[PDB]
Amino acid sequence: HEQPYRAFSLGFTANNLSGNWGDYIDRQDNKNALMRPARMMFTDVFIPTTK
Amino acid sequence: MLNFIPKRCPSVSLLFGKRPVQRIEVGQARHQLEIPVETIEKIYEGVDSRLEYHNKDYNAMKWKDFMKLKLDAYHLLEASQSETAAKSAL
Amino acid sequence: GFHFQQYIAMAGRAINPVQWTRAWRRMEGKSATEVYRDALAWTNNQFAQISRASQYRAWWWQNPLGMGLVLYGTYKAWHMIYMVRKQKKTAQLVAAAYGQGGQWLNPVPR
Amino acid sequence: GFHFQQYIAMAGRAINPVQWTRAWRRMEGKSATEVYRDALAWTNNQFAQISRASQYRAWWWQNPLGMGLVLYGTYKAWHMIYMVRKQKKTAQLVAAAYGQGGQWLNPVPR
Amino acid sequence: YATLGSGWSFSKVQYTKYRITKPWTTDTTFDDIILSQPSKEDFAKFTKEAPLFLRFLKLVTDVEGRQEAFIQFAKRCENGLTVEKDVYVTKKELVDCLWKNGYTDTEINAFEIAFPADYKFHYPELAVLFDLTEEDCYKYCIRQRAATPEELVELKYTKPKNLVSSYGLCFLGVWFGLSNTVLSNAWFYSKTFPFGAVFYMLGSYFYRDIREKLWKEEKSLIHTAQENKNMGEESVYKQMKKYATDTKCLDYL
Ligand SMILES: CCCCCCCCCCCCCCCCCC(=O)OC[C@H](COP(=O)([O-])OCC(O)COP(=O)([O-])OC[C@@H](COC(=O)CCCCCCCCCCCCCCCCC)OC(=O)CCCCCCCCCCCCCCCCC)OC(=O)CCCCCCCCCCCCCCCCC
Ligand SMILES: CCCCCCCCCCCCCCCCCC(=O)OC[C@H](COP(=O)([O-])OCC(O)COP(=O)([O-])OC[C@@H](COC(=O)CCCCCCCCCCCCCCCCC)OC(=O)CCCCCCCCCCCCCCCCC)OC(=O)CCCCCCCCCCCCCCCCC
Ligand SMILES: CCCCCCCCCCCCCCCCCC(=O)OC[C@H](COP(=O)([O-])OCC(O)COP(=O)([O-])OC[C@@H](COC(=O)CCCCCCCCCCCCCCCCC)OC(=O)CCCCCCCCCCCCCCCCC)OC(=O)CCCCCCCCCCCCCCCCC
Ligand SMILES: CCCCCCCCCCCCCCCCCC(=O)OC[C@H](COP(=O)([O-])OCC(O)COP(=O)([O-])OC[C@@H](COC(=O)CCCCCCCCCCCCCCCCC)OC(=O)CCCCCCCCCCCCCCCCC)OC(=O)CCCCCCCCCCCCCCCCC
Ligand SMILES: CCCCCCCCCCCCO[C@@H]1O[C@H](CO)[C@@H](O[C@H]2O[C@H](CO)[C@@H](O)[C@H](O)[C@H]2O)[C@H](O)[C@H]1O
């Protein structure tokens, strides 16, 4: 009753349960290994790196 | 029948009262019937001008008169359907 | 649906500043009720044109789904033009404030 | 241009294997000259239909640029479907063999 | 807009993949009257030949007793009558109006023998022939043309408008709408294209079955209404015919 809750998002279009973004310090990729090379395909907008 | 009386203005019903007679086709066989324009004009005394429908070309009668008309029609029809009907309307 | 080109032209005239002065002059001796009624009447005229002419006429875009496809296309255009643009801006904002994905971070552990 | 849907359907039938057996049976007692003449005649029939019917008839896609826009669209579709795909493959190949931009590197200095 | 017309025919249309084509004209353009909402100046004008109508007009005026109108109209109309092209009433419609409004069989037969079957009367002709106002005749012609709006009307050609601003706005639209990964999304390929393509294929394959299954009830209702109307009218007519001979009692008495 003193520990805090994680945000909840669920719908036919999007959710926040298929992944975990981590904490503010210890972050992690929300997408799993098989679809990380195709992250672009899971976005409405994508701004690439500068290299 | 509906309570839709055509406006007798020439922009709607061209040549309404230019002659003293009206004509209509009746039924599937389209029998001809002629009616005096005065008998017709008797309707536009009960017509109400506040109401206008169907592109503002048809007014509506007052319910009293319209239902009297419907009742006369219904009486004639049920007399036609019946066999003990009076041989005269006197 | 119909008159999309006319709608684009209306938007163009609206953004043109000279038309702002023209409208300022036209608004002399005019009421908000009159303006609202005129706009509502214009919209009703459009929808009534559709309802009447769909019974006998077919546009160049007619398809086995009818006006449903044109309406979906209008919606999708609105989406990609406005909502995805706002999403891009919000994404850059979140990435500058918290880092990418900062709005979905878990609460600080206790 | 015309009959794009029929062309898609022809491609589908061509890829269907059962049609391969059907064509194998149809090729009994047939010559390469006959096959070539039939294909050439089909293409000529398409282009002749266009030349004749453009004089009096207008398709749903008619526009102030006419069939030029449909032909440009065919070209652009071919480009994006085939050539850009080949470019993607070549890009990955070059990036695995030399690194990104490896085909534009300057010669080794002397 | 209201559905004008005196017809009980339940009519639906099927579309083709070809557009409507009209003869080339450098000054006119064909459009739908209800979608254009044209005005008298937007309508296109042309010259019509008088004599065939002026003869009948002279006859009618000599019968009615107004020759000043004929003289004025003829001096106005010489070298052809310049009038709006697609504002007219057909001979059949005019004959129906005359008959239902009580013009004699002699006059109707005169009309029939005088004018061809495909003749088209315009509002100035109607006004000068029936001693009415050209405004009212114009409105009547417009209503009768809207009753048959499948036929396109001929307007004056006008160049497009606001092309530069429209180009600017369309560039803005593409610049903001295609700078994204929407048309390459997993959502696109998994939901938008499959669902849309399946709907399109089902609609193309059952286009007519659906329409018929929907229109069955409306067709039945229209049939029922027409049958009821006919039977009631016939019954009332025959009963009034039966009772038509109840007035001679007085003149017998
Ligand atoms: C510990 C245990 C815990 C266990 C778990 C416990 C769980 C918690 C407790 C639960 C307790 C139970 C509570 C109940 C459950 C809660 C459910 C809930 O709250 O929802 C949350 C959840 C959302 O919450 P969320 O956190 O916000 O999620 C992220 C967002 O949703 C993300 O948004 P987005 O980015 O994905 O965008 C979505 C977009 C989606 O927008 C659209 O989909 C619209 C697309 C329209 C395209 C065509 C439009 C054409 C119209 C043209 C108009 C004229 C031209 C005008 C031009 C401008 C307009 C285009 O926007 C909208 O959603 C708009 C919605 C508002 C409008 C609704 C319209 C309803 C109309 C209905 C029509 C009915 C017709 C009946 C006819 C029958 C047939 C005869 O619900 C959802 O799943 C969202 C999607 C809902 C689906 C709506 C789809 C409507 C589509 C209507 C189409 C009509 C067309 C008909 C055609 C057929 C006839 C031809
Ligand atoms: C790029 C596409 C992707 C867009 C972003 C992704 C969005 C996805 C969602 C899609 C949602 C669609 C919205 C559906 C709602 C309904 C829209 C509708 O039906 O009315 C539209 C509207 C038609 O208005 P309307 O109310 O039906 O009245 C028709 C008039 O009476 C005139 O009567 P008419 O008989 O003379 O002609 C009727 C109609 C005829 O429309 C047709 O039937 C199409 C004719 C060709 C058949 C093949 C079409 C596809 C391939 C060729 C066209 C490529 C462009 C893609 C066009 C997509 C629409 C089909 O006219 C047109 O619509 C002309 C459209 C073609 C304009 C070509 C401009 C070329 C500049 C761009 C460079 C070339 C393309 C680059 C590659 C793009 C590849 C994606 O079309 C307009 O855009 C009006 C333009 C006004 C002048 C603006 C100044 C010039 C700027 C030119 C661009 C105009 C914006 C178009 C952007 C696309 C080109 C970048
Ligand atoms: C995604 C677009 C971007 C593409 C990639 C970028 C490429 C850029 C370069 C563009 C180059 C264009 C090529 C020009 C060459 C000429 C092509 C041509 O004129 O003939 C095309 C051809 C018409 O053949 P036709 O020889 O003229 O004979 C017509 C028939 O007699 C039938 O006669 P009818 O009177 O019944 O109908 C005539 C015509 C009527 O066409 C129209 O007038 C259009 C009607 C609506 C007006 C507004 C159009 C734009 C907004 C709504 C449509 C969104 C899709 C974009 C369509 C672009 C083309 C206008 O029919 C159609 O063409 C149907 C096209 C609409 C199919 C909708 C399928 C929905 C699935 C996708 C999900 C929804 C869209 C997602 C968002 C996409 C946003 C970009 O159209 C076809 O695709 C045939 C489909 C055959 C069935 C295939 C199985 C179903 C699969 C559905 C997809 C079919 C492929 C379309 C891909 C686009 C949707 C993903
Ligand atoms: C808070 C921080 C932010 C604050 C800053 C805000 C910044 C705002 C900037 C101002 C612009 C606002 C957005 C609207 C833009 C105009 C769009 C437009 O109307 O175009 C459609 C316009 C109309 O053509 P259409 O739509 O196809 O058909 C309609 C007919 O044309 C028929 O059209 P019409 O009859 O309706 O009018 C015709 C008019 C069309 O000419 C125009 O394009 C109108 C441009 C007027 C701009 C005025 C800006 C006012 C705000 C800034 C204040 C500056 C002080 C000057 C004050 C004005 C007194 C001189 O003129 C002509 O076509 C030639 C005849 C000349 C007759 C006299 C015209 C002047 C009238 C007297 C001034 C009226 C002032 C009204 C009071 C405003 C009170 C708010 O055609 C054009 O596209 C013209 C060319 C587009 C203009 C740009 C040319 C390329 C140069 C690009 C700039 C360089 C790139 C940027 C880099 C800059 C680095 C520094
Ligand atoms: C209320 C329940 C009903 C509504 C269901 C709502 C949507 C369900 C979410 C998608 C289910 C599949 O989700 C899929 O499996 C798990 C989800 O944690 C994720 O998998 C990831 O997290 C799990 C942790 O358990 C790891 O073991 C795994 O190595 C990692 O890849 C995937 O990234 C996701 O793609």
Query: By the CB < 8 Å criterion, does E181 face chain A?
Result: yes
HEC sequence for chain D: CCCHHHHHHHHHHHHCHHHHHHHHHHCCCCCHHHHHHHHHHHHHHHHHHHHHHCCCCCECCCCCCCHHHHHHHHHHHHHHHHHHHHHHHHHHHHHHHCCCCHHHCCCCCC
Q: In Å, how far is A13's CA from the nearest CA of chain C?
A: 14
The tokens describing A41, both together, are 């395909």
Using CB atoms, pick whichever of B22, B29, B76 lies closest to residue E240. B76
Handedness of CA E205, E208, E209, E211 (dihedral sign): positive
- Give all strands (DSSP E) within chain C, no chain letters: none
For E137, residues 6+ apart whose C-beta sits below 8 A from its C-beta are B10, B14, E123, E124, E126, E127
D9 CA closest ligand 3 atom index:
86
For a pocket test of ligand 5, which of A16, A18, A42 has the largest count of ligand atoms closer than 8 A to its C-beta?
Answer: A18
Query: By the CB < 8 Å criterion, does B57 face chain E?
Result: yes
Using CB atoms, pick whichever of E181, E186, E187 lies closest to residue A45. E181
Q: In Å, how far is C27's CA from the nearest CA of chain A?
A: 43
Residue D58 to residue E17, Cβ atoms within 8 A: no
Within 8 A of C47 by CB-CB distance, chain E residues are: none
- Subunits adjacent to chain D (3 or more Cβ pairs under 8 Å): C, E
- Least Cα distance to C105 among E185, E19, B34, A19 occurs for A19
The residue whose C-alpha atom lies closest to atom 82 belonging to ligand 3 is: D5
A10 CA closest ligand 5 atom index:
6
- Least Cα distance to E88 among E35, E147, E7, E24 occurs for E147
Within 8 A of D62 by CB-CB distance, chain C residues are: 60
The residue whose C-alpha atom lies closest to atom 22 belonging to ligand 1 is: A11
Question: Best interface-test mutation with A: which of E178, E187, E195 has the largest number of A CBs within 10 A?
Answer: E187
DSSP summary character for residue E18: B
Residue C105 to residue A4, Cβ atoms within 8 A: no
Torsion of CA D58, D64, D65, D70, to 10 degrees: -50
The residue whose C-alpha atom lies closest to atom 85 belonging to ligand 3 is: D5
DSSP state letters, A1-51 = --SPPPP--B-SS-BSSS---B-SSSB--SS-GGGGGGGGGG-S-------
Question: Best interface-test mutation with C: which of E35, E150, E152 has the largest number of C CBs within 10 A?
Answer: E35
C-alpha to C-alpha distance for D110 and E130, rounded to whole angstroms:
105
Q: CB–CB of A10/A18 below 8 Å? A: no
The tokens describing E73, both together, are 């109209």
- Contacts of residues E174-180 at CB distance under 8 Å and 24 or more positions apart, as own/partner, are E176/C80, E176/C81, E176/C82, E176/C85, E177/C77, E177/C80, E177/C81, E177/C84, E178/C80, E179/A45, E180/A44, E180/A45, E180/C80, E180/C84, E180/C88
Q: CB–CB of A18/C101 below 8 Å? A: no
Resolution, given in Å to one decimal, reads: 2.8
C-alpha to C-alpha distance for C18 and C12, rounded to whole angstroms:
11
Distance C24 CA to ligand 4 centre (A): 17
- Least Cα distance to A27 among C106, C93, C97 occurs for C106
Count helices and strands (H / E) in chain E: 12, 6
* H or E element, residue E52: helix E51-64
The tokens describing D35, both together, are 């096959």
C-alpha to C-alpha distance for E4 and E145, rounded to whole angstroms:
10
Residue A41 to residue E184, Cβ atoms within 8 A: yes
For A25, residues 6+ apart whose C-beta sits below 8 A from its C-beta are none
Within 8 A of D60 by CB-CB distance, chain C residues are: 60-62
Q: Does ligand 3 lie within 6 Å of residue E197's CB atom?
A: yes
Residue E18 to residue D59, Cβ atoms within 8 A: yes
Residue of A nearest to C80 (CA): A44
The tokens describing B2, both together, are 């509906």
Distance A29 CA to ligand 5 centre (A): 13
The tokens describing E143, both together, are 């209503």
Within 8 A of A43 by CB-CB distance, chain E residues are: 181, 185
C-alpha to C-alpha distance for B12 and E136, rounded to whole angstroms:
8
Q: In Å, how far is B5's CA from the nearest CA of chain E?
A: 14
Length of chain C: 110
| CA–CA–CA angle E57, E45, C9 (5° rounding) | 150
- Least Cα distance to E189 among D93, A42, D95, D92 occurs for A42
C-alpha to C-alpha distance for B67 and B72, rounded to whole angstroms:
9
- The burial of E194, by beta-carbon neighbours within 10 Å (0-12 exposed, 13-18 middle, 19 or more buried), is given as exposed
